[PDB]
Design a protein around this ligand. Structure first.
Ligand SMILES: *[C@@H]1O[C@H](CO)[C@@H](O)[C@H](O)[C@H]1NC(C)=O
Ligand SMILES: *[C@@H]1O[C@H](CO)[C@@H](O)[C@H](O)[C@H]1NC(C)=O
Ligand SMILES: *[C@@H]1O[C@H](CO)[C@@H](O)[C@H](O)[C@H]1NC(C)=O
Lengths: 178, 50, 99, 126, 99
């Protein structure tokens, strides 16, 4: 009988031995998955320079999350960065008082919120977006006047109910000089 | 430094159990592996349990 | 320091494979059959969840300790700053006057 | 299929976080009103300008607090962990501390047991 | 509320199969032979044991916190009801008279 065995020894994913017929152009900056030279992953792409050795191939980092991709055809270097993520909190008054609420996302920017049933589309784009260092809460009006701390939000912000939910900086009590 | 082209393996018939995948499940001809060493040899073929 | 070290320990547990073949989420899916790596996923998630439970328990212990320390801080602040205490070595060394 | 361990872990961490928020609120928010030191600084010779906030620096802290904050002092973010901000920032905590300092300097000990009544600092020390 | 929630979570864990085929041991005995039911039951045992261990640890933490609260309550009783205390904010807001 004729038998052939193969060594394999899978330790380095971006190598030179692969011939899939699929070909696609390179993406500069899009929050999309990548499959360059057999290496899979997700994140956003960003171009930068690094003193990489020529004979070497790629660079892996903590938790074996590679931060570099090289084009087999054209010689250039790009860096990767994982996508923005976080929880979403809901700021509500008493359920019997009213039904309207104001969500608060975690440490994310207001730009990518719309990207990430018909009533749910309203909160995506946002008509009263408030940007705060604790998070990007929407649906609550920002008032310059300050009040007592009713609902706890991070970094000295508090939301109350006056027929619309408002968000303000909490006051530390009435001032007085003896 | 070649194209591998493992799709030819599914052709013909007979062969034997692969009994060696040992990575993870999804698609066959995507990963680039590390090194493809072919060491074809001919035995009596009485038992391949070795 | 303890918080940062515990957090670093928690994230280093993703590198260990807990007896599986690989230890990364992308290497969870290459070419073989799901069950073959489903057990592998079972092995991975068991270890990761055990590490997470260990982290949560240690955090609970440390939170209880810090809550006790801060309750002491609150009562000390309220009894030494907001008044003069007759306790011997509760508001310093010697006869306490003000804080 | 492994159960509901994740809900318990999330609940425990959330409980710890709210515990710390309420904890710092309990430690510092000991007064209902904000007191401020009078513009003229005379207390019989005691020099509190070293211990009170100074208007010159943009950060409303005291020179002891500046050393206390400077003396004591990254790709781990992107694997499923976040750090929530404290309920009240460092500026508000410093404002609470400044109010407490002004209260104990001017009123004495009575600002924590009712209305604050002024009294000269030499008499308070007496 | 915390005690009831922990108890409800503990009982609800029996529904989860922890990677087995069924959460009811009667069906496990009825379908699986004892040589194979031996290895199938192991998952149920380890999962329920892990749930019970987590519950016991959480209850220990809660009991420590409640013991701290009870010690504080006993101290306040002895120092405010059985006498008059000079500690300022230990007996309400203002000068203490009685409790
Ligand atoms: C909310 O209002 C309803 C009135 O329909 C009342 O039955 C309920 O007790 C209220 N809940 C609270 C927490 O006040
Ligand atoms: C959010 O994105 C906008 C768009 O460029 C930018 O101006 C803003 O500074 C970003 N927010 C933060 C907190 O950097
Ligand atoms: C409130 O603050 C904003 C932001 O500084 C300012 O544009 C606005 O004029 C202030 N007053 C009112 C009434 O909105």
């Amino acid at each position: 009988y004729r038998v052939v065995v193969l060594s394999f020894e899978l330790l380095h994913a971006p190598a030179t031995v692969c011939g899939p017929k699929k070909s696609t152009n390179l993406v500069k900056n899009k929050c999309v998955n990548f499959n360059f030279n057999g290496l899979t992953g997700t994140g956003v792409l960003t171009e930068s320079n690094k003193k990489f050795l020529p004979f070497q191939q790629f660079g892996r980092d903590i938790a074996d999350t590679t931060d570099a991709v090289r084009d087999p055809q054209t010689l250039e270097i790009l860096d990767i960065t994982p996508c923005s993520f976080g929880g979403v909190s809901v700021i509500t008054p008493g359920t019997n008082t009213s039904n309207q609420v104001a969500v608060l996302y975690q440490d994310v920017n207001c730009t990518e919120v719309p990207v990430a049933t018909p009533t749910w589309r309203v909160y995506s784009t946002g008509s009263n977006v408030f940007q705060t260092r604790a998070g990007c809460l929407i649906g609550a009006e920002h008032v310059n006047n300050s009040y007592e701390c009713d609902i706890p939000i991070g970094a000295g912000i508090c939301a109350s109910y006056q027929q619309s939910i408002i968000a303000y900086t909490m006051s530390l009590g009435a001032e007085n000089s003896v | 430094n070649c194209v591998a082209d493992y799709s030819v393996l599914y052709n013909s018939a007979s062969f034997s159990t692969f009994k060696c995948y040992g990575v993870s499940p999804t698609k066959l001809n995507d990963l680039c592996f590390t090194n493809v060493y072919a060491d074809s040899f001919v035995i009596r073929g009485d038992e391949v349990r070795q | 320091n303890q918080n940062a070290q515990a957090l670093n320990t928690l994230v280093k547990q993703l590198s260990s494979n807990f007896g599986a073949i690989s230890s990364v989420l992308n290497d969870i899916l290459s070419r073989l059959d799901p069950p073959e790596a489903e057990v592998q996923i079972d092995r991975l998630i068991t270890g990761r969840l055990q590490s997470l439970q260990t982290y949560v328990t240690q955090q609970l212990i440390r939170a209880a300790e810090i809550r006790a320390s801060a309750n002491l801080a609150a009562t000390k602040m309220s009894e030494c700053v907001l008044g003069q205490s007759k306790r011997v070595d509760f508001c310093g060394k010697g006869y306490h006057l003000m804080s | 299929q492994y159960g509901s361990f994740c809900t318990q872990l999330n609940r425990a961490l959330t409980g710890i976080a709210v515990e710390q928020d309420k904890n710092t609120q309990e430690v510092f928010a000991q007064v209902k009103q904000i007191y401020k030191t009078p513009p003229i600084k005379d207390f019989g010779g005691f020099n509190f300008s070293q211990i009170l906030p100074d208007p010159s620096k943009p950060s409303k802290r005291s020179p002891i607090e500046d050393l206390l904050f400077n003396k004591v002092t990254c790709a781990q973010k992107f694997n499923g962990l976040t750090v929530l901000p404290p309920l009240l920032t460092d500026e508000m905590i410093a404002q609470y501390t400044s109010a407490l300092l002004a209260g104990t300097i001017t009123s004495g000990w009575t600002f924590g047991a009712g209305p604050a009544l002024q009294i000269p600092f030499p008499m308070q020390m007496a």
